[PDB]
């Protein structure tokens, strides 16, 4: 290439347009969220159905217990017809924030489980859970009323 | 489904979902066409997958021109394993291409070429004979 041709090619080079304000650093305009999700909607529906149907719920911390012992305790509860369900906290928070049980949001921290029942077998559930003294009864609800472990013991007695 | 037998522009998707893209110019012949068709028929299933040619029958092929296009209900990984081998067997540099990246690249290139903010352009200089630059310039380069 001749030097003049090289100079011409250098001068006719693409130069990018520079906006005054960077797109990343300017305020991001509000945008529509996802239209729908296959799993989150199902989880919300299941949570609503369980909350409406079951009258007694007990929210406790799910410790890293052995699977065999956990299944034995689940069978013991099923002998009294109590269902153990665990849902993601990142999905439970959105439902709990705007619902009847708004004050129970702080309960759902980390690995949590809910023992639910249509029949409030509180005494039987407490006697079954007393086998493992390290399992803490974080909270509960009976007839749409917020209650703690002491209140649950009072109701059982 | 199988490509029709071959005897002895076009850079955008029309029907298919994946394609074979060429990065350089080349020439294709009856032997190449027949070998590629045989390989595609051997590595394809007529029940679900369809393949379409885009080049004319015997052939000069330019850069970025799609020659073989693949469609059906399949993922990119299901077709890449064989389209990469077809691209390697092709007589020029070629690659298995996906629309989700090809269209994005084309749109970005068009946007850059439209948003170029250089006041002086090579076409402008060559046409206006500025600086007397056509003293050192090819006669075909005025349009080329």
């Amino acid at each position: 290439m001749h030097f003049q041709r090289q100079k011409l090619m250098a001068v006719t080079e693409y130069i990018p347009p520079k906006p005054a304000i960077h797109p990343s650093c300017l305020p991001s305009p509000p945008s529509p969220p996802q239209e729908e999700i296959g799993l989150i909607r199902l989880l919300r529906r299941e949570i609503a159905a369980v909350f409406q149907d079951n009258r007694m719920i007990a929210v406790c911390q799910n410790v890293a217990l052995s699977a065999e012992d956990k299944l034995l305790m689940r069978h013991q509860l099923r002998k009294h017809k109590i269902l153990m369900k665990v849902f993601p906290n990142q999905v439970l928070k959105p439902f709990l924030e705007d619902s009847k049980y708004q004050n129970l949001l702080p309960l759902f921290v980390g690995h949590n489980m809910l023992l639910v029942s249509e029949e409030p077998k509180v005494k039987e559930m407490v006697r079954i859970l007393r086998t493992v003294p390290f399992l803490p009864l974080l909270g509960g609800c009976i007839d749409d009323t917020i209650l703690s472990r002491q209140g649950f013991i009072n109701y059982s007695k | 489904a199988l490509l029709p037998a071959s005897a002895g522009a076009t850079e955008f998707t029309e029907g298919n979902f994946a394609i074979l893209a060429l990065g350089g110019g080349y020439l294709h012949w009856g032997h190449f066409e027949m070998m590629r068709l045989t390989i595609n028929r051997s590595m394809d299933p007529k029940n679900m997958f369809a393949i379409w040619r885009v080049p004319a029958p015997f052939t000069p092929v330019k850069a970025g021109r799609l020659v073989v296009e693949m469609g059906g209900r399949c993922e990119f990984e299901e077709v890449q394993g064989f389209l990469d081998q077809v691209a390697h067997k092709l007589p020029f540099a070629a690659k298995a291409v996906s629309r989700g990246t090809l269209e994005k690249m084309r749109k970005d290139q068009e946007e850059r070429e439209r948003n170029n903010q250089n006041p002086w352009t090579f076409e402008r200089i060559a046409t206006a004979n500025m600086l007397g630059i056509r003293k050192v310039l090819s006669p075909y380069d005025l349009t080329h």
Binding site: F3, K7, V11 | -
Partner: peptide
């Protein structure tokens, strides 16, 4: 030996192009 352009060479080319463009304008009336 490779050759490369510089900033002031760029400026000189651009100013000469501007002069020739002004000549183009004035040669149109």
């Amino acid at each position: 030996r490779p050759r490369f352009v510089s900033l002031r060479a760029k400026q000189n080319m651009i100013r000469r192009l501007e002069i020739e463009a002004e000549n183009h304008y004035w040669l149109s009336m």
